């Protein structure tokens, strides 16, 4: 059977008995930087199994009225294991990621989720012509919620779900790498994202490489059951990570 998948990174393993195929970025597997493309001169560090392993972020609840959530990376993993320390102590960084989303429900539930990774997901403010801090869009591992109605507070991003906070049609996000979690036939989605940027390496504290979004296209529904919500969990694992430019931490 091709409906069972197993992933082993470092000292962690992920097993799924109910899953679809695996999507690999734009057809490119993560890899180390080549000699003829590098620009920095000093030897890079390659923490191997210490940084390349699965790290489970906090879990969320899926209710009948949920609208969606998003996470920004690597700020989400900024304070996780040795990966966060190595980020803090280095000036330049580079790594691909493997994203796994878990969501399981009985055969009597119905719903559809869209899992998509949006590189360079620049967002606009609620009040046009008014700046926001770096807290309305990323505060560590916590998830940020979309809104059904138009956002009105000037201190946070425009959370209109149908526009996805980017001024584009929400239905056109299919262009980016993505997968669907349909409770009829699926419980997890796996995406392998290579390193995408305009430069060989970049600082991970100043730049958000990509954004992860989960949107329920078909609202959850059920009848006459004791289960009131369906938790969702997200797991991420850096791949082929290498850092350069040791400075004082922070």
């Amino acid at each position: 059977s091709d409906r069972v998948r197993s992933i082993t990174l470092g000292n962690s393993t992920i097993t799924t008995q109910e899953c679809a195929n695996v999507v690999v970025g734009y057809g490119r597997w993560p890899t180390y930087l080549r000699d003829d493309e590098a620009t920095a001169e000093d030897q890079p560090t390659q923490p191997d199994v210490a940084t390349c392993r699965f790290y489970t972020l906090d879990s969320i609840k899926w209710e009948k009225g949920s609208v969606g959530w998003w996470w920004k990376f690597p700020e989400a993993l900024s304070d996780m294991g040795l990966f966060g320390q190595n980020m803090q102590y280095h000036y330049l960084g580079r790594a691909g990621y493997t994203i796994h989303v878990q969501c399981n429900a009985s055969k009597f539930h119905q719903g559809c989720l869209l899992v998509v990774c949006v590189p360079e997901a620049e967002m606009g403010g609620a009040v046009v012509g008014q700046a926001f801090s770096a807290t309305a869009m990323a505060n560590g591992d916590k998830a940020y919620e979309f809104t059904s109605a138009t956002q009105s507070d000037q201190t946070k991003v425009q959370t209109a779900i149908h526009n996805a906070g980017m001024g584009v049609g929400v239905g056109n996000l299919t262009i980016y790498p993505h997968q669907w979690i349909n409770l009829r036939t699926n419980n997890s989605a796996t995406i392998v994202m290579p390193y995408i940027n305009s430069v060989p390496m970049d600082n991970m504290f100043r730049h958000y490489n990509f954004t992860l979004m989960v949107i329920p296209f078909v609202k959850l529904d059920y009848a006459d059951t004791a289960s009131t919500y369906v938790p969702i969990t997200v797991t991420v694992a850096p791949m082929c990570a290498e850092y350069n430019g040791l400075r004082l931490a922070q």
Binding site: A20, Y26, E120, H162, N163, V168, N182, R206
Partner: protein, 278 residues
């Protein structure tokens, strides 16, 4: 040998007959993120068709290979306000909506540029218009970042020794020129989800990576007894283009020249009901 001698039609349709088997091309699963590769030959009987259509006009090179206006401004030959006798424009491609949207369909671009300048002049209205003036001449100055900037029409900075410049006389063909790929990075970035300072503070968005310089224009020495107004239009035409990571086209109307801010918009228009087709 003083010479060096240096087309891909769309797929054809194959004949298909009646079928009855366990193979089911029609059924698939979109949950995999995979777009189905079925063809009409796989779900109905079809004749053999030789197709000569080609996708030549849909290439990115041709799609972006059209000159489009990016900026216009007016300056007077003579006036009391010093700042009103010359133009100073920071180079950016976000000013005009059509070209902005065309470029914003891709995340990263790498191309050469071809710049064309169209200049026109007109005499301002007044109570006394009778005068005789010879043909006017204009100077276009390009100042890379960090260079000196003129503060008036007759400033010393207009004596370019290293800054490229073009002198143009009215009545001739529009000025034209070529620019190579001049980005510090490996490709231009239409979007930048990040900050300027390392502590996640300061400027945010694509405004941080805009350091292309300035352009200045003036009348060389024309100073009419009566005011004369001139307008300049700048046209960009990418060449040898390469693109990466396509993204959905924008839906909401633009509102700022250096921000993504927008107002929520409906997905599309409505109709009477789900069955209305008239």
């Amino acid at each position: 040998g003083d010479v060096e001698e240096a087309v891909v039609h769309v797929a054809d349709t194959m004949r298909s007959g009646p079928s009855n088997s366990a193979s089911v091309p029609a059924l698939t699963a979109v949950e995999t993120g995979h777009t189905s590769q079925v063809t009409p030959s796989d779900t109905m009987q079809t004749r053999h068709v030789k197709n000569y259509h080609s996708r030549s006009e849909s290439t990115v090179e041709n799609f972006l290979g059209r000159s489009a206006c990016v900026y216009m401004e007016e300056y007077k030959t003579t006036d009391n306000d010093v700042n009103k006798k010359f133009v100073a424009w920071p180079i950016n491609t976000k000013q005009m909506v059509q070209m902005r949207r065309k470029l914003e369909m891709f995340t990263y671009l790498r191309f050469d540029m071809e710049v064309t300048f169209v200049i026109t002049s007109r005499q301002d209205p007044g109570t006394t218009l009778a005068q005789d003036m010879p043909v006017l001449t204009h100077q276009i100055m390009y100042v890379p970042p960090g260079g000196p900037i003129p503060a008036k029409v007759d400033d010393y900075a207009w004596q370019t020794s290293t800054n490229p410049s073009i002198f143009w006389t009215e009545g001739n063909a529009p000025a034209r020129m070529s620019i190579p790929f001049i980005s510090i990075g490996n490709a231009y970035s239409n979007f930048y989800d990040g900050w300027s300072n390392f502590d996640q503070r300061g400027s945010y968005g694509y405004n941080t990576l805009n350091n292309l310089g300035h352009i200045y224009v003036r009348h060389v020495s024309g100073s009419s007894p009566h005011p004369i107004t001139s307008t300049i239009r700048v046209y960009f035409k990418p060449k040898h283009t390469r693109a990466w990571v396509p993204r959905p086209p924008r839906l909401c109307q633009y509102k700022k020249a250096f921000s993504v801010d927008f107002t929520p918009t409906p997905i599309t228009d409505t109709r009477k009901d789900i069955n209305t087709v008239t």
